[PDB]
Curated annotation (Swiss-Prot), chain B:
GO terms for biological process: adenylate cyclase-activating dopamine receptor signaling pathway; cellular response to catecholamine stimulus; cellular response to prostaglandin E stimulus; G protein-coupled receptor signaling pathway. One of its GO terms (molecular function) is G-protein beta-subunit binding. Adrenal gland and brain. The gene is GNG2. The chain holds residues 6 to 62 of 71 of the full protein. G proteins are composed of 3 units, alpha, beta and gamma. In this context, interacts with GNB2. The heterodimer formed by GNB1 and GNG2 interacts with ARHGEF5. The heterodimer formed by GNB1 and GNG2 interacts with GRK2. Component of the TAS2R14-GNAI1 complex, consisting of TAS2R14, GNAI1, GNB1 and GNG2. Forms complexes with TAS2R14 and G-proteins; these complexes play a role in the perception of bitterness. Component of the TAS2R14-GNAT3 complex, consisting of TAS2R14, GNAT3, GNB1 and GNG2. Component of the TAS2R14-GNAS2 complex, consisting of TAS2R14, GNAS2, GNB1 and GNG2. It comes from Bos taurus (Bovine). This is Guanine nucleotide-binding protein G(I)/G(S)/G(O) subunit gamma-2.
Swiss-Prot record, chain C:
Residues 27-34 are cytoplasmic. The chain holds residues 186 to 238 of 593 of the full protein. It is linked to Metaphyseal chondrodysplasia, Jansen type: A rare autosomal dominant disorder characterized by a short-limbed dwarfism associated with hypercalcemia and normal or low serum concentrations of the two parathyroid hormones. It is found in: Cell membrane. Homodimer in the absence of bound ligand. Peptide hormone binding leads to dissociation of the homodimer. It comes from Homo sapiens. It comes from the Eukaryota. This is Parathyroid hormone/parathyroid hormone-related peptide receptor. Expressed in most tissues. Most abundant in kidney, bone and liver.
Length: 129, 57, 53, 53, 235, 341, 83, 52
């Protein structure tokens, strides 16, 4: 059974640092492309970042470029998202998603409401106290 | 809400699936072996048929 | 001199075109309106050469 | 010799039709090109032969 | 024996004549696929092209310009997942991709959708006609200045209007800079992988404009001509 | 409220896994070592059927292994005669996009469906000889993926909204609805005795459904990607499933777990159609790399390779008597393969 | 761009033998005396290119054709595998 | 202004006006309203709710 577990999150002061861990089991992590998705309160899912099979190709959306760092570990079968310079608007629920097909550059419906190849996700709240 | 209803339906389905009778692999496999052996002579693909009775000449 | 030049050139073209016509005809995938005209053109070159001979 | 020359023209005309025309009728144009490539040179040879004879 | 075979062959030949006639019409028409999120004014385009008269599931619109028929298909009642039913559209002449250039926040989603369509393994030969719909709303928003595109796309600050661009004399230079930046972003995805197998044709489209049909006809003509040239290994 | 239910589900799932492991007495490959290998199989194309305009998406054989039905994306549904190559019917379908077609065991009716979400059934009993749309079914929101005939009045239908339906032809309304999938259902296979049918979906799982009760019995989760093909064993106590991960897996209903997986390192493409032979020894799976592979169901060895298609093999079918195998691809050609001595 | 010019020149060269462009050089020349430079160069020019035009056309459009090469490769591979 | 965008949004159905204005659920199209015959009743209902 393909299952993804997300670890890390909670309350983080703005401008701080955080790390997100995505543990994958039930399939070959190296062969499948990885992705990160977030859902802001009251908004829809939006694509955050992607990393290729070998990590030689990485991309980011405009709102996060230069702030987040995405890395993957094939030996440990885990995917990471390093977050820093957090802003109050970045609060959302982060999902660890997998491109459906192997040995493929595309993946169509990663940011879909009923995607069956994504983890439960975790809550991140950038609120000053 | 829909989420709780879906979870309850899944739990009920799993409960039904669990309470079934299961036969051991060796016993369940022997039936397949016997079926294949018994009908081996009646399989044109496994046993090529002479061209005279073959309708695809 | 002109006779030897064109006789040699026509001979090679016939051999090359004959292989070409056989190739196009045998494969069913290559059967297309574009290839039919190519076969017609290739043939016309052959009849031209043999008649000259 | 004439049919080979016209079949070269047929190939050129066929390519021009493909690029510059948005619709094609293979059943009609293909036969028309074949007749033009073969029949018309025969007419010119026939009239030349008749005149010469 | 002989009578049955003759009857069977006669029926078979009867079906053949019908198929040949069907082959003539099937090749005559050009199939198109219309795609885009609902923020894009896809519906309005459908009404505009309905002028050329010729559970719900997919819908088809037939419009004729210059004596050539198009069949445009749109998927209204379909599931969000599209990795499976998009494969059967690999034989269509082109895919019309409509983008609402005035959303900004949802613009990145359109880029990802275009990226998936462009790089699909089966859609490697289908050209994409990119329609940046309702440019008027984008123009009004840029002049207003309340929302700044720089926040969503930080690169926009270091962007310069292309020299080959041809803005309207009576249009604000800010508007052309914004719209051409969006065009450049899409073309970056188009040229990242697509080199010669299939091409993207950007266009600036308004919902009320009636010129969309002519643009599609010209784009289809270019695609067919390019395909014919490729068959001769000339391009 | 959600946590107490999710944890219980995880505990249950663990219990099922433990039950599966407990009954894993041995491995199928281990007990098949002392079996003579099938050996190389050479199949030649006996009949080539052409005339379809667009790509072939699906096909179905007849009960008598004489007439077959093929559907093409151009909107044509042609009934071919496998022996003399003659065409019996050519149905101009209302919707061009068609994803499946079915042939009734009696042969009086033929069903079809596609992106229109409408299951159209045509009757061939008309005395005039003019085909017509006998019945139309409109109850599915997603795209129509597959459909199989139970009898002249009952039909099992699969759609892309994670729903399977059991329609009654005379009334034209769903009799039973199957709702236990979380992904698009691609295809289903009917058991020989027409009591249970299995369905494979895009959630990398296969579910067994009871036609009468209308409730799922067993769920199998052993695949890594979308399941595209699925077929019953001739004896009905097992079924084989093909997926995009370039692997075929055999599942046993009684064992409630996968038995053996057919995978090759060189093969990295998807799988479109799979079917068993009459005896079930062979597994003919149509692969995405422009050809089909015949596997040994007991040794997981590539018995043979059928490479006679210019594009992906969309569909594959085997006769009831197993004389020949018909494969349809996206090149608008139907190839019939038969063994030779 | 340089690439575009390279493709255009390559495309022009392949299409030249098919269209018989070389014929235009001496199309409009009337009957010139045999003992003349123009006559000698014309005969050598035409009798060389006209003869080899068929050879060039066959090479470019059948032997060098991508579809023909792919078709031959498949048939040879299948025949070798069967054998 | 720009009622066409409102009509398209209503037809698409991704955004439901009921969330922003809960009283829209208990709203009925005015009898005196004169919608176009070829226009969806939902569009007239929404636009007349805004007008009301």
């Amino acid at each position: 059974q393909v299952q993804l577990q997300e670890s890390g999150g909670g309350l983080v002061q703005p401008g701080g640092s955080l790390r997100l861990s995505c543990a994958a089991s039930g399939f070959t992590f190296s062969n499948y492309k990885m992705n990160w998705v977030r859902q802001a309160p009251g908004k829809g899912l939006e694509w955050v970042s992607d990393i290729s099979q070998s990590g030689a190709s990485i991309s980011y959306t405009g709102s996060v470029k230069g702030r987040f760092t995405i890395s993957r570990d094939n030996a440990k079968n885990t995917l990471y998202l390093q977050m820093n310079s957090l802003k109050p608007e970045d609060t959302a629920v982060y999902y660890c998603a997998r491109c459906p097909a192997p040995f493929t550059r595309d993946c169509f419906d990663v940011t879909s409401t009923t995607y069956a190849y994504r983890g439960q996700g975790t809550q991140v709240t950038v609120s000053s106290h | 809400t829909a989420s709780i209803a879906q979870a309850r339906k899944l739990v009920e389905q799993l409960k039904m699936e669990a309470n079934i009778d299961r036969i051991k692999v060796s016993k369940a496999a022997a039936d397949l072996m016997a079926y294949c052996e018994a009908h081996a002579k009646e399989d044109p693909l496994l046993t090529p048929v002479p061209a005279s009775e073959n309708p695809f000449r | 001199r002109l006779a030897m030049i064109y006789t040699v050139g026509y001979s090679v073209s016939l051999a090359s075109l004959t292989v070409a016509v056989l190739i196009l005809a045998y494969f069913r995938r290559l059967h297309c309106t574009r290839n039919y005209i190519h076969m017609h053109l290739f043939l016309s070159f052959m009849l031209r050469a043999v008649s000259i001979f | 010799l004439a049919t080979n020359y016209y079949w070269i023209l047929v190939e050129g005309l066929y390519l021009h039709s493909l690029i510059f025309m948005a619709f094609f009728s293979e059943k009609k144009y293909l036969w028309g090109f074949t007749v033009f490539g073969w029949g018309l040179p025969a007419v010119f040879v026939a009239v030349w032969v008749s005149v010469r004879a | 024996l002989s009578a049955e075979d003759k009857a069977a062959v006669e029926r078979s030949k009867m079906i053949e004549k019908q198929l040949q006639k069907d082959k003539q019409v099937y090749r005559a028409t050009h199939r198109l696929l219309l795609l885009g999120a609902d923020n894009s004014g896809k519906s309005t385009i459908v009404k505009q092209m309905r002028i050329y008269h010729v559970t719900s599931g997919i819908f088809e619109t037939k419009f004729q310009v210059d004596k050539v028929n198009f069949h445009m298909f749109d998927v209204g009642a379909q599931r969000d997942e599209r990795r499976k039913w998009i494969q059967c559209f690999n034989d269509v002449t082109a895919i019309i991709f409509v983008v609402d250039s005035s959303d900004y926040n949802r613009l990145q989603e359109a880029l990802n959708d275009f990226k998936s369509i462009w790089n699909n393994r089966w859609l490697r030969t289908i050209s994409v006609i990119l329609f940046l719909n309702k440019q008027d709303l984008l123009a009004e928003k840029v002049l207003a200045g309340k929302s700044k595109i720089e926040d969503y796309f930080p690169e926009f600050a270091r962007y310069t209007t292309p020299e080959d661009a041809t803005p309207e004399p009576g249009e604000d230079p800010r508007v052309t800079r914004a719209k051409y930046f969006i065009r450049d972003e899409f073309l970056r995805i188009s040229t990242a992988s697509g080199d010669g197998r299939h091409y993207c044709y950007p266009h600036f489209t308004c919902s009320v404009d009636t010129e969309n049909a002519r643009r599609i006809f010209n784009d289809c003509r270019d695609i067919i001509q390019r395909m014919h040239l490729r068959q001769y290994e000339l391009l | 409220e959600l946590d107490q239910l999710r944890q219980e589900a995880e505990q249950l799932k663990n219990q099922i896994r433990d039950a599966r492991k407990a009954c894993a007495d041995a491995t199928l490959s281990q007990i098949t070592n002392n079996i003579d290998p099938v050996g190389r199989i050479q199949m030649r194309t006996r009949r080539t059927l052409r005339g379809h305009l667009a790509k072939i998406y699906a096909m179905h054989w007849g009960t008598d292994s004489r007439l077959l039905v093929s559907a093409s994306q151009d909107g044509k549904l042609i009934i071919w005669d496998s022996y003399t190559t003659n065409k019996v019917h050519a149905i101009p379908l209302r919707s061009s996009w068609v994803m499946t077609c079915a042939y009734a065991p009696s042969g009086n009716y033929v069903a079809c469906g596609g992106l229109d979400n409408i299951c159209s059934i045509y009757n061939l009993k008309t005395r005039e000889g003019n085909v017509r749309v006998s019945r139309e079914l409109a109850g599915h929101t997603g795209y129509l993926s597959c459909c199989r005939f139970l009898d002249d009045n009952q039909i099992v239908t699969s759609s892309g909204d994670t729903t399977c339906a059991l329609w009654d032809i005379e009334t034209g309304q769903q009799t039973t609805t199957f709702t236990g999938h979380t992904g698009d259902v691609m295809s289903l296979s009917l058991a020989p005795d027409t009591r249970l049918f299995v369905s494979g979906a895009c959630d990398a799982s296969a579910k067994l459904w009871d036609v009468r009760e209308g409730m799922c019995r067993q769920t199998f989760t052993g695949h890594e990607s979308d399941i595209n093909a699925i077929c019953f064993f001739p004896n009905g106590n097992a079924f084989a499933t093909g997926s995009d991960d370039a692997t075929c897996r055999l599942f046993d209903l009684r064992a409630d777990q996968e038995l053996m997986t057919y995978s090759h390192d060189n093969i990295i493409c998807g799988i479109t159609s799979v079917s068993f032979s009459k005896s079930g020894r062979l597994l003919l799976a149509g692969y995405d790399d422009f050809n089909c592979n015949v596997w040994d169901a007991l040794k997981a060895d590539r018995a043979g390779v059928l490479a006679g298609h210019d594009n992906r093999v969309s569909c594959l079918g085997v006769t009831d008597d197993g004389m020949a195998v018909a494969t349809g691809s996206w090149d608008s050609f139907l190839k019939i393969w038969n063994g030779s001595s | 761009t340089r690439q575009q010019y390279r493709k255009l020149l390559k495309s022009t060269l392949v299409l030249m033998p098919l269209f018989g462009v070389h014929y235009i050089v001496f199309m409009a020349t009337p009957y010139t005396e045999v003992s003349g430079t123009l006559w000698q160069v014309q005969m050598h020019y035409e009798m060389l290119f006209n003869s080899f035009q068929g050879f060039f056309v066959a090479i470019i459009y059948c032997f060098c054709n991508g579809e023909v090469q792919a078709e031959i490769k498949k048939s040879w591979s299948r025949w070798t595998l069967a054998l």
